[PDB]
Each structure stands twice: as C-alpha cells, then as structure tokens.
Scaffold this motif. Sequence first.
Motif, PDB file in Angstrom:
ATOM      1  N   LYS A   9      50.111  49.368  50.909  1.00 19.78           N
ATOM      2  CA  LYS A   9      49.202  49.764  49.898  1.00 19.78           C
ATOM      3  C   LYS A   9      50.138  49.782  48.786  1.00 19.78           C
ATOM      4  O   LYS A   9      51.367  50.690  48.801  1.00 19.78           O
ATOM      5  CB  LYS A   9      48.568  51.131  50.426  1.00 19.78           C
ATOM      6  N   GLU A  11      50.007  51.285  44.655  1.00 15.76           N
ATOM      7  CA  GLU A  11      49.119  52.029  43.721  1.00 15.76           C
ATOM      8  C   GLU A  11      50.049  51.720  42.170  1.00 15.76           C
ATOM      9  O   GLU A  11      50.704  52.319  41.998  1.00 15.76           O
ATOM     10  CB  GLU A  11      49.156  53.211  43.949  1.00 15.76           C
ATOM     11  N   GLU A  12      48.893  51.134  41.507  1.00 25.59           N
ATOM     12  CA  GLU A  12      49.495  50.851  40.031  1.00 25.59           C
ATOM     13  C   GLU A  12      48.694  51.927  39.235  1.00 25.59           C
ATOM     14  O   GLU A  12      47.467  52.010  39.104  1.00 25.59           O
ATOM     15  CB  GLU A  12      49.231  49.679  39.527  1.00 25.59           C
ATOM     16  N   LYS A  41      43.309  54.357  38.612  1.00 29.38           N
ATOM     17  CA  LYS A  41      44.092  53.785  39.541  1.00 29.38           C
ATOM     18  C   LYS A  41      43.920  52.401  40.012  1.00 29.38           C
ATOM     19  O   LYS A  41      42.855  52.276  40.045  1.00 29.38           O
ATOM     20  CB  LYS A  41      44.221  54.709  40.825  1.00 29.38           C
ATOM     21  N   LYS A  42      44.670  51.682  40.447  1.00 25.14           N
ATOM     22  CA  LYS A  42      44.621  50.334  40.806  1.00 25.14           C
ATOM     23  C   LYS A  42      45.556  50.068  42.245  1.00 25.14           C
ATOM     24  O   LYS A  42      46.331  49.914  42.345  1.00 25.14           O
ATOM     25  CB  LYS A  42      45.127  49.436  39.745  1.00 25.14           C
ATOM     26  N   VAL A  43      44.624  50.131  43.103  1.00 18.00           N
ATOM     27  CA  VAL A  43      45.320  50.007  44.600  1.00 18.00           C
ATOM     28  C   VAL A  43      44.985  48.787  45.297  1.00 18.00           C
ATOM     29  O   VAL A  43      43.889  48.177  45.524  1.00 18.00           O
ATOM     30  CB  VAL A  43      44.678  51.205  45.441  1.00 18.00           C
ATOM     31  N   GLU A  63      41.649  44.811  46.339  1.00 12.90           N
ATOM     32  CA  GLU A  63      41.837  45.388  45.152  1.00 12.90           C
ATOM     33  C   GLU A  63      40.951  46.343  44.528  1.00 12.90           C
ATOM     34  O   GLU A  63      39.993  45.829  44.210  1.00 12.90           O
ATOM     35  CB  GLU A  63      42.382  44.243  44.022  1.00 12.90           C
TER      36      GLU A  63
ATOM     37  N   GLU B  11      53.563  52.734  42.844  1.00 16.98           N
ATOM     38  CA  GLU B  11      54.012  53.369  43.881  1.00 16.98           C
ATOM     39  C   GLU B  11      53.592  52.792  45.108  1.00 16.98           C
ATOM     40  O   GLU B  11      52.583  52.047  45.337  1.00 16.98           O
ATOM     41  CB  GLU B  11      53.105  54.635  43.803  1.00 16.98           C
ATOM     42  N   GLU B  12      54.572  52.776  46.069  1.00 16.08           N
ATOM     43  CA  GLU B  12      54.589  52.392  47.246  1.00 16.08           C
ATOM     44  C   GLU B  12      54.815  53.195  48.173  1.00 16.08           C
ATOM     45  O   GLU B  12      55.922  53.707  48.197  1.00 16.08           O
ATOM     46  CB  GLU B  12      55.520  51.075  47.143  1.00 16.08           C
TER      47      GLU B  12
END
Lengths: 79, 76, 79, 78, 76, 76
Positions: A9, A11-12, A41-43, A63, B11-12
């Motif tokens: 996963k 997260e941007e 958030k863009k996961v 997405e 984030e990762e």
Amino acid sequence: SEFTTKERKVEEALPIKEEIRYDASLPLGKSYLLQEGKAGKKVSVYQDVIVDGKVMATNLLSETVVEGQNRILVKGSLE
Amino acid sequence: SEFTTKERKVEEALPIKEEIRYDASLPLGKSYLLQEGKAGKKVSVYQDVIVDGKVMATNLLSETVVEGQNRILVKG
Amino acid sequence: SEFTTKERKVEEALPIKEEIRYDASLPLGKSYLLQEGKAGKKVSVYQDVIVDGKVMATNLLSETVVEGQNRILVKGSLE
Amino acid sequence: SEFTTKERKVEEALPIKEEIRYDASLPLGKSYLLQEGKAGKKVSVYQDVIVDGKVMATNLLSETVVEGQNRILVKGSL
Amino acid sequence: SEFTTKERKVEEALPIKEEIRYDASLPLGKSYLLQEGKAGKKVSVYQDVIVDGKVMATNLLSETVVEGQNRILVKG
Amino acid sequence: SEFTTKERKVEEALPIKEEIRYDASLPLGKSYLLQEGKAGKKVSVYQDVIVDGKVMATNLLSETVVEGQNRILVKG
C-alpha cells in the motif's frame, strides 16, 4: 524457479486545497486562517511478484482518492 | 511551454520484523506473543516538474524511515 | 525515580557529489564551476529518557537522507 | 567646469499579477488559491554627471525586470 | 525520469527610436542628421527544464533592456 | 431550516482498456486475441446535503478505481 506474491500500500499526500473566503468585517490587509486543513489522500495497492527474494514485477490493484480538509484563508478583500 | 514545480510526499509501510524466541519452561507447540509488532514507514518527498498540467519528471528530495517495532514470539 | 523525555536531531553532512560535464565551446585545459553544489545530510531523530538529569537510554525514532545539490564542473575535454 | 560620472542601482518591487480562472464543477462563489504568486522586481541602473558637486543630469543605462510569479485563483462557475 | 535545469541568455536588438526636431528655419523640404542613433538590446534570461537530454519547457527569469540612443533628425 | 447530510455509494464499470500489439511476422490484416478484457470498477462515495427532506446538492468524498484487465490483440 518458484514465486510468491505480496501486496503493498502506497499513500501519496494530495496538495492541500486552500479556500480564500471574504469577510467584510476584516480590515483591508487583515486576514487569518479559519482552519489549517488536512491533506487529501491517494492510496494505491500494488502486488509484487517475488523470485529469489527479488521483486520481479508489480501490478497496480487499486487506486483510491480521498478528499481532504480545506485550509480556509479569510481576508478583508474580494479577489 | 512554461513549467512549475511541486512537492510530493509518499508513504510506504515497511514489512514488520518478527523475532522468534524460545522457552523450555513452555510446552512445545505453545506460542505466546511477547511483543506485538509495529510497522515502520518509509516517507519520500519528491519534486515534480509540471508542464501543461502534467508531471513530466520528478527528482527525489528526501527519504525518511520511521523505525517501527519488531514483533516478538515465544515458542516453547 | 521519575523521568522525562526529550528529542534531539543529529545531522551528518554527506560528501558533496560532483558531476563533470563536457562543453564543446570551452578551450582544452579550461573548466569552471557551473554550480558550487551543496551537501546532503543524514538526519537522525532520537528520543532520550532522562533520569536525575542524565540520559539513561535512547531510541532512534527516525533516519532521513536529504539529497544535496550537485557540484557541477564544466570543462573543455571529455573524460 | 570639469565633470565626473557616477552610477546608481535602484530597485522596486513589482505588483503581483493575478489571473482568475473558472471551473464549472466548483460551487458558485467559492474560490481556491491555485498559485500563491511572488512579486517581480525592477532594477534600474542610472548614470549621473556631477559638476561642481551637483548632479547636472542622469541617463538610464539599463532596466531589468526580474520576473516574479503570478497569483492564480479559480472560481466556481455555472 | 529525473530532471535538471539550465539557464540561457538571449540578446535581441531593439528598434531604433526616432526623433524629429524642426528648424533654424531650414528650407522646408530638406533635412540634416542630428544624431546617429544606436539600437538598444533586450537581454532575456531563461531557465530550461531538461529531461532525457531534451528541453521540455522554459521560463523567463529576467528581461533586461540596455538603452540605446535615438536617431535624431532635423527637418526644415 | 436546518440541513443534514447523507453519503451514497455508486459503482460503475470502467471502459475496458484496449491494447494493440503489432507483429510484422503474422500476415496482413490478421488479428489474434492474447487476453480477454475485464472492466475496471469505479466506486464513488458522495455526500448529499438534505434540506427539508430533499437532496439539494452533492459532493464527491472519495473515488476508488479497482483496475481491470486489458484486452490485448495482436495485429500488424
């Protein structure tokens, strides 16, 4: 050679959106923030293929884009 | 055309480390969680070059690793 | 006894990276700095447990690598 | 009646330019800041001629406009 | 891909400003050169974004106009 | 009067992504199916503002796209 898969996963953070709001109460150059706002958030969920301990390839499974909280700037002029 | 730049934080989650300990005082076959793990994370900040509304490239600015805590399991 | 905690960041300068570029307009044996460049840094954030005015233990909370700015050297010959 | 020459650099902040855009999907009457905007700068170089301690004249040697950045705002529309 | 920037300078000659005085009561129809007049130069400074060895976009950083001198002409 | 909100979930099939891979090997105007397509699934969550019992407007709160499977065809 055999293989295995694992999901990831990522997260941007989305750019904070800033609303400029006019308030006739404030003077000319006076302005304050009503709220600081939180980033959206863009996961992305990915799937990796592992061969000999190495990611040999990866697919994007999904997405998801979630709207954040606006940063509100209040000023005494209308642009 | 012209171009602008912007910051992009990504984030990762990092794989949790799992240590396995042993205890003779414990019956073989039994497993107790001595410490629930905690996933650390890798935070990357990039700089994107934007042209006509599209990201045409990106440079790495920083790479952070927020540690996290190992999962610990005791097996008799 | 009781205790207090405090965070501290440690910064280690990183060796400046230097790129060498070729400029056909430059005379042989002539070169100049196109960009002095800046050093990247490795920043570690630690948490200390203080007992009676003296650090009794510390945990590493974070480890960050901040890229630097390359030193650009342009010369009139191609290595 | 002899003269000397002297140079002066003058600077002044330029007003930030603001563009206004429209978006149909956005609620009417709502504004979002797309780009903050940064002031440009005008740098002028002048040359004075001094005669007997006073400036008898001055010419404009050069004028540089260091580009700033536009402020961009989007408004909701019907 | 990553990107890099580079600054370009560009000089461009400006038109020559013209000026026309008018007398000493010279035979209306004739004219004498009062001043040669030289062209001013505009110096533009750009910054290009390079991706995979190709300029992908460019921004104007500055614009400098180095003043010239008018071509003054006296006409009768 | 006062207003309240309600969220609604909406799912849609996404247009199948068509991929064409050419091959100078195989003859003219011939095409073979390498992979059947499968549409992507788009799940959008909306928020309706309700006044006096009726929906007056609605905002988008989140949008998820579950990737599909490209339909791949060999032409050339």
